Coordinates of C-alpha atoms and ligand atoms in Angstrom, one line a residue:
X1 CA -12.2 4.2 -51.1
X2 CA -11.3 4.1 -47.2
X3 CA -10.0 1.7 -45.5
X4 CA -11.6 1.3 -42.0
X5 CA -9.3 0.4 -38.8
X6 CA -10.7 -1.9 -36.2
X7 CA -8.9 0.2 -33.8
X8 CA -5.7 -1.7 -32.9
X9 CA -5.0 -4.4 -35.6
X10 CA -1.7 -3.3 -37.5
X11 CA -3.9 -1.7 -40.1
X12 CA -6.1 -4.6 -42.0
X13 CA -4.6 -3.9 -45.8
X14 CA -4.5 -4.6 -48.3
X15 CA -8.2 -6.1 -47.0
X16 CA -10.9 -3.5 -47.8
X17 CA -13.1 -3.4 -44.9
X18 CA -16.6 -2.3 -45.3
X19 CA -18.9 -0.2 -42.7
X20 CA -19.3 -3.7 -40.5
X21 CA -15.5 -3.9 -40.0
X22 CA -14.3 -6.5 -42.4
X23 CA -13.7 -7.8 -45.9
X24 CA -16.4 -9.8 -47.6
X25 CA -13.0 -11.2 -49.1
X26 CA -12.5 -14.2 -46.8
X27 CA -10.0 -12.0 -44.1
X28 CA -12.1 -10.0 -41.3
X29 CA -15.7 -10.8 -40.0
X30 CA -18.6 -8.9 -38.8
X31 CA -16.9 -7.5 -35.9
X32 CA -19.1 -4.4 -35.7
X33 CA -16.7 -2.2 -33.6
X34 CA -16.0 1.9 -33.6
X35 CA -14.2 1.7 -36.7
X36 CA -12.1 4.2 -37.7
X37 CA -11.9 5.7 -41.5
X38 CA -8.4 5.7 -42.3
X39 CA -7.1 6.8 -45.9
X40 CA -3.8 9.0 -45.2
X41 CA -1.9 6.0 -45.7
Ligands
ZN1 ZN1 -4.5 1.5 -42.3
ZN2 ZN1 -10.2 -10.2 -47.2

């Protein structure tokens, strides 16, 4: 799938963020920001 950016963290791999803006894998919370669906890279 896509990873989603948090807009200005260093891209968050290899975490796989969800819609809420983090990993459900112990990494990135429920930040729930303008998160940006990033996959050419
Ligand atoms: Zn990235
Ligand atoms: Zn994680």
């Amino acid at each position: 799938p896509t990873h989603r950016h948090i807009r200005g963290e260093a891209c968050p791999l290899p975490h796989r963020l969800n819609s809420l803006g983090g990993c459900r894998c112990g990494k990135y919370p429920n930040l729930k920001k303008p998160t940006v669906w990033r996959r050419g890279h």
